[PDB]
Design a protein around this nucleic acid. Structure first.
Length: 483
DNA sequence: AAAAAGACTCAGAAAAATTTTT
DNA sequence: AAAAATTTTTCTGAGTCTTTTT
């Protein structure tokens, strides 16, 4: 169904009808075989069901060094006791006297056991799996069958944040139907909660896209279940995403001229803003929103850089006015880069950097909101993130341009393609991994044009899954598309 | 005015399928 | 074939940006 060949809905309205079967809850907990033992202070101790299970989580991760760290254990053990009966709380005073080995051994067993299984067994579980997909992996939005991305409820276990995360080891509880909110069209058949239960709520909100949600206990973040990238609802937003970035293309040099001018501004705020944008524009720096203390690991972005994240070098290794960046970004991915900037920028930074402590905010007097506000003014619907797309995609365009070899073999052209990709991955700082940018930053039409231009079969670049994702791009693109 | 809540994009790990060698 | 290597898929965490609320 070439949904791209249809009329987009008004703004706000996401669909008119929607019907799903709700989430597949995590299966029940089967207790350990009586032969599988736990010991506390070297004394066999059979645990309460809830307690046992939790111990199993830990027991199941015992080999990761994860389990050696202080936050993890502290976080872990605390939560576990909560799940203990009173009397258990009385005996297990600490985690250090617990023996999860028999527990650890057991599962490892189960592991290899599975890793060696009969082929028939291998197929039985696939057919099983497949059956699941047919039953809960699709929904009906408006007039068609659409696949649901994540239909399996998040299973209880131990929280695993990125980097030096303060909530590492905390227990994720089991989500009950009483925690789930259902989103569907009023006229649609309501999925029936499991026997003996009730949904938290059933809503019919067509301004949103999700079919189910609930709140994740450890961060209080709302989780959702939405459709597949192949969705119209998904593919449309993405097509629009790239559309916007091309609009930026069309007024980038203008915006640029402005900020360069603002560097000169009287009001320092205007200056911080402008420098900040310089970076975003030039280095592809993220917004850098203000994170809630103690909730996540310490990672910063453009607007949230603390003065200690950059080191100013009037000169270094040949170049002058070099900015040395060194911080952890989203997912705690490290950002390190020595950058020769405009003398003006450099000068502003010294100024932004004076009279402060290492922990102070470089661009104090500035935030993402302030930033984006100005951006939208410059261009309707313009945000810091648009810059990243624009850059990636535009970088891909020229790179492939200058790199694409006419007197080249398909095998050869593919590499040209992949190098052009590295350049992007490089700027986006994906760690090197071309996946993210290929999948989320590059206007696929660019790749479709190229394949066509160079008589290279899409199949050679895009995998099955990706093709389904970029089908719009695939079906509606000239050899002559130009981002 | 601002902060908390809400929703949707993008991120690498872990795992599972596939392929490629030995 | 085994087992090692690579690619694909699943998972859900981590941001951006928005809207509600106070």
């Amino acid at each position: 169904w070439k949904w791209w060949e249809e009329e987009r809905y008004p703004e706000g309205i996401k669909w008119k009808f929607l019907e799903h079967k709700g989430p597949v809850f995590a299966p029940p907990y089967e207790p350990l075989p009586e032969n599988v033992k736990f010991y506390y202070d070297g004394k066999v101790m059979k645990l309460s069901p809830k307690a046992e299970e939790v111990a199993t989580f830990f027991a199941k991760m015992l080999d990761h060094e994860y389990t050696t760290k202080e936050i993890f254990r502290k976080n872990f053990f605390k939560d576990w006791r909560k799940e203990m009966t009173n009397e258990e709380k009385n005996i297990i005073t600490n985690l250090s006297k617990c023996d999860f080995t028999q527990m650890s051994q057991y599962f490892k067993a189960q592991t290899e056991a599975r890793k060696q299984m009969s082929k028939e067994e291998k197929l039985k579980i696939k057919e099983e799996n497949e059956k699941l997909l047919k039953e809960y992996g699709f929904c009906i939005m408006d007039n068609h069958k659409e696949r649901i991305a994540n239909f399996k409820i998040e299973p209880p276990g131990l929280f695993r944040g990125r980097g030096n995360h303060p909530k590492m080891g905390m227990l994720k509880r089991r989500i009950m139907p009483e925690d789930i909110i259902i989103n569907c069209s009023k006229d649609a058949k309501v999925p029936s909660p499991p026997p003996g239960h009730k949904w938290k709520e059933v809503r019919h909100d067509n301004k949103v896209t999700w079919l189910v949600s609930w709140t994740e206990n450890i961060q209080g973040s709302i989780k959702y279940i939405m459709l597949n990238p192949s969705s119209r609802i998904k593919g449309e937003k993405d097509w629009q995403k790239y559309e916007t970035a091309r609009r930026l293309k069309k007024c980038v040099d203008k915006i640029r001229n402005q900020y360069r001018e603002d560097w000169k501004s009287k009001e320092m705020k205007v200056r911080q803003r402008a420098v900040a944008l310089y970076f975003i524009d030039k280095l592809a720096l993220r917004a850098g929103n203000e994170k809630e203390e103690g909730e996540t690991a310490d990672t910063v972005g453009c607007c949230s850089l603390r003065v200690e994240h950059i080191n100013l070098h009037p000169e270094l290794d040949g170049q002058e006015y070099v900015v040395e960046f060194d911080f952890l970004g989203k997912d705690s991915i490290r950002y390190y880069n020595k950058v020769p900037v405009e003398k003006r920028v450099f000068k502003n930074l010294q100024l932004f950097m004076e009279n402060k402590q290492p922990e102070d905010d470089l661009f104090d007097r500035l935030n993402t909101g302030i930033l984006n506000k100005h951006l939208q003014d410059l261009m309707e619907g313009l945000t810091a993130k648009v810059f990243r797309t624009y850059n990636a995609s535009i970088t891909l365009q020229q790179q492939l341009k200058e790199l694409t070899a006419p007197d080249e073999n398909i095998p050869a052209k593919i590499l040209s393609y992949n190098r052009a990709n590295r350049a992007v991955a490089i700027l986006c700082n994906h760690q090197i991994a071309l996946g993210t940018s290929k999948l989320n930053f590059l206007d696929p039409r660019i790749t479709v044009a190229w394949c066509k231009k160079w008589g290279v079969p899409i199949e050679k670049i895009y995998n099955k899954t990706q093709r389904e994702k970029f089908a719009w791009a695939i079906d509606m693109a000239d050899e002559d598309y130009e981002f």
